From a paper:
Among these key enzymes, the NAD+/NADH-dependent MDH was predicted to be important for further engineering as it converts OAA to malate, which is a committed step toward SA biosynthesis. The crystal structures of MsMDH and CgMDH were determined and detailed structural comparison was carried out. The two structures, representing the mitochondrial and cytosolic MDHs, were identified to be quite different from each other with a root-mean-square deviation value of 2.77.
CgMDH showed high activity at relatively acidic pH and the highest activity at pH 7.0, whereas MsMDH showed the highest activity at pH 9.0 and dramatically reduced activity at acidic pH. At pH 5.0–7.0, CgMDH exhibited significantly higher kcat compared with MsMDH, which is consistent with the results of the optimal pH study above. On the other hand, CgMDH activity was reduced only to a small degree due to relatively mild substrate inhibition as reflected by its high ki values over the entire pH range. The β7-β8, α2-β2, and α7-α8 connecting loops include a catalytic histidine residue, the NADH-stabilizing residues, and the OAA-binding residues, respectively. Fed-batch culture of the PALK (pMS3-cgmdh) strain produced 87.23 g L−1 of SA with yield and productivity of 1.29 mol mol−1 glucose and 3.6 g L−1 h−1, respectively; the titer, yield, and productivity all significantly increased by amplifying the cgmdh gene.
Numbering used by the authors:
A (entry chain B), B (entry chain A): 8 to 96, 102 to 330
Write the structure that this text describes.
Amino acid sequence: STKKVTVTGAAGQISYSLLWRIANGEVFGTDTPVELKLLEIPQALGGAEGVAMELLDSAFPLLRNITITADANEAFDGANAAFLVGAKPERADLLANNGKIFGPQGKAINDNAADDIRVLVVGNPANTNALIASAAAPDVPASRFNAMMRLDHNRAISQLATKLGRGSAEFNNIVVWGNHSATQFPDITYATVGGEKVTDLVDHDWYVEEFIPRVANRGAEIIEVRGKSSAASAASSAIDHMRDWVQGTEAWSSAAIPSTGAYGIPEGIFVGLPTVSRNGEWEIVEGLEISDFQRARIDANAQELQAEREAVRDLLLE
Amino acid sequence: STKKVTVTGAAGQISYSLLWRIANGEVFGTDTPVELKLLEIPQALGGAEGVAMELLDSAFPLLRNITITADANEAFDGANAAFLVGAKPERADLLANNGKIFGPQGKAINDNAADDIRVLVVGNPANTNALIASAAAPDVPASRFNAMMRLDHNRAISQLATKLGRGSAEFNNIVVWGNHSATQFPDITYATVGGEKVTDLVDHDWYVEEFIPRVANRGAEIIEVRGKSSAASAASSAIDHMRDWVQGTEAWSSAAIPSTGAYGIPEGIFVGLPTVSRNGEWEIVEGLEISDFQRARIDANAQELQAEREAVRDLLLE
Ligand SMILES: NC(=O)c1ccc[n+]([C@@H]2O[C@H](COP(=O)([O-])OP(=O)(O)OC[C@H]3O[C@@H](n4cnc5c(N)ncnc54)[C@H](O)[C@@H]3O)[C@@H](O)[C@H]2O)c1
Ligand SMILES: NC(=O)c1ccc[n+]([C@@H]2O[C@H](COP(=O)([O-])OP(=O)(O)OC[C@H]3O[C@@H](n4cnc5c(N)ncnc54)[C@H](O)[C@@H]3O)[C@@H](O)[C@H]2O)c1
C-alpha cells in the first residue's frame, strides 16, 4: 500500500524541514509506507544526494525507497502526492520567472502521476503557480491542485491565541480568503473560542488595523528577525495541509482550491476559502452570510488573482 | 499534564530540525501538551527569538508555551526532559572547550529541574559531556543522563538495509558499543533479519573492513557530500532516543548509559550498550556471550572513554 510522494526543490530550506515529517508517517499515517521522489535542477542534484543520504541514515521504518532526479517524468512517475516547493524566492518578474517552471511540472504530473494524485503548490506565487500547473494537466481534475494558505491560516490562529491568552487548539472557523500575498483576508467573522464569538472578545478596530496587517506581513517580520525567510513553519503548514486533505478534518483549514463561483468569486482562479476535508476532497462551507466589510476584502483578493492570471495567460499550456 | 522540555543550542542547525518533532507530539505522545524552554548564549538570543516566532506560527495544538533565555536556571526550571545540543565545533582542546559548558548545565539541572528529569546529551564529545553533566548533579541519579549514539545505530541499520535489500524495520538486536567516535563498534553478533542471523548473510571481512569504518566515518562522509555536518538525521535520532526512553521499546536501541561494570566495562563512563526501554528506564540486555573479536573492540572503546575522562577530570564539579 506504498504512497509515492514527490517533493520538488528537494535541496532547499523548506524541503529540509518537510521530508523528515513525511517519512515519520505524519501525512499518510503511521501504518502507511512511503517512497520519496526528490526533484531538483541539475546544478543542485549534489545537494539532493546529501539529503537522500541523511534520510537513509534516519532509518525511518515507513521509508521504503528514495529516488533523486532532474527528470520531471522520473520524479512524478506513479506519484500519489506532490509538494511543488521548487521555485526561486518586481512582482511581474516573479509571476513569469516561476510561472515557466509550473507549466512543464503540470504536464509531467499529467503524463506520469497516478490516478489519485494530489498536488500542493508551496512555490511562490502559490495561487497562480497552481493555476499554471493545473492548466498544463487537462487529464487531471483541477481540484487535485491546491495552493498553500495554511501558513497564513496557522499565523492567524497563533496571533488570536497570543492576544486572548488561549490555546491555538481552542479556536474554530478561521478563514483566510483569497491570495497568498499582503492582500490576504484573515477573517474572524465566524470564529469561536469555546462557545464564544471571537468578535465579542476583540476590538474590531485593533483586528482590522493591527491583526490583519501583522498576519498579512508576517513573512517580512520573519526575514527581519531571522535574516532569511521562514522554512520550518512553512514546511509544518504544508504537512498540516496534506495530512488534512488525505485524512480529513472538520476544522476549517483555508485550502486554496479552484473557484466554483461560490461567494461571488469568479471561476478560473485558485483561492483561499472556508474548507473542510471529507473522503479525501476539500468541500466549501456553504450558507455563510457575507457582510459589506467581508465583500470588499474578498473582491480585493479575487481581483488581484484575475490580475495575476492575465499576467501569466501565455504560460497556460492548454 | 504538561511536559516541560528544555532544548540548549536552540538557534543551531540540529535544534531547527528537532523542535518541530517535539511540538508535534512525536516524543511524549499526541495527548501530551508540551512547553519548550530554549537556552542560548547571549549572542544567539536574537536567533532563538526567530525560532520561537516560527514555532508559534505553526499553531501546534500541543505547544502551550515557549520560553527563550540565556540563563540556565530559567531554562531548566521544572524541566521534565532536556536535549543538550549546545556546544562549540585537536581532541584534548575539544574535550575541555565543550567540557566547561556541561558542568554548569548539570548543576543548573540539579538545582532547578523536576524530580523526573531525563537528559539526552547530543553536543560533542557526547559520552564525556554526559559524564561531566552527571558529576555536577549529585542529587540526580546518573541514569537520568544519556549520550546519543542513536545516529550511529540508525546508520548501522540503514547500511545493513542497503547491503541486503531489506527494510530498516526488519533488523533486530543491533548494538553500537562504546564511544560516539571513529572507535565505535557497530556489532552484528546477535542481529537478525527475516529469521536468519545477519552474520550468516554478510561476508565477515566486508563487515569488519568495509561496514564498520563506513558507519564509524559516516559523519565525515556527510560533511563531504553536503559541506555541512548532519542536522536533520542527528535531530531525527535524538527524537528516536527520547521517544524510546519515554514510551518504551522491545528493540535494542544503543543508549549510551552509565557503565554498571557490565560486560567488563569499568564504572565511571557513559557507554553505548545493548539496551531496551521499559517503564521510563533503559535496561541493559544481560547474559550475552562476548567473543574475543567483540572483546578487543569493546575494550578499545572503554579505554578511549577512560582516556577522555582523565583529560576532563578537573571539570568534574563534585
Ligand atoms: N506559504 C507559502 O506558500 C510559502 C511559505 C514560505 C515560502 N514559500 C516559497 O517556497 C519556495 C521555496 O522556498 P525555500 O526557502 O525552500 O527556497 P530555497 O532557495 O531554499 O529552495 C528552493 C529550491 O528549489 C530549487 N528549484 C528551482 N527551480 C526548480 C525546478 N524547476 N525544479 C525543482 N526545484 C527547483 C532550487 O534549486 C532550490 O534548491 C519559494 O518560492 C518561497 O517563496 C511559500
Ligand atoms: N550523534 C551525535 O551525538 C551528534 C550528531 C551530530 C552532531 N552532534 C553535535 O551536536 C552539536 C550541535 O550541532 P549543530 O549542528 O546544531 O551546531 P550549530 O553550531 O549549528 O548549533 C550550536 C548552537 O549551540 C549554541 N551554544 C554554544 N554554546 C552554548 C552554551 N553554552 N549554551 C547553549 N547553547 C550554546 C550556539 O550558539 C549555536 O547556536 C555539536 O557539538 C555537534 O558536533 C552530535
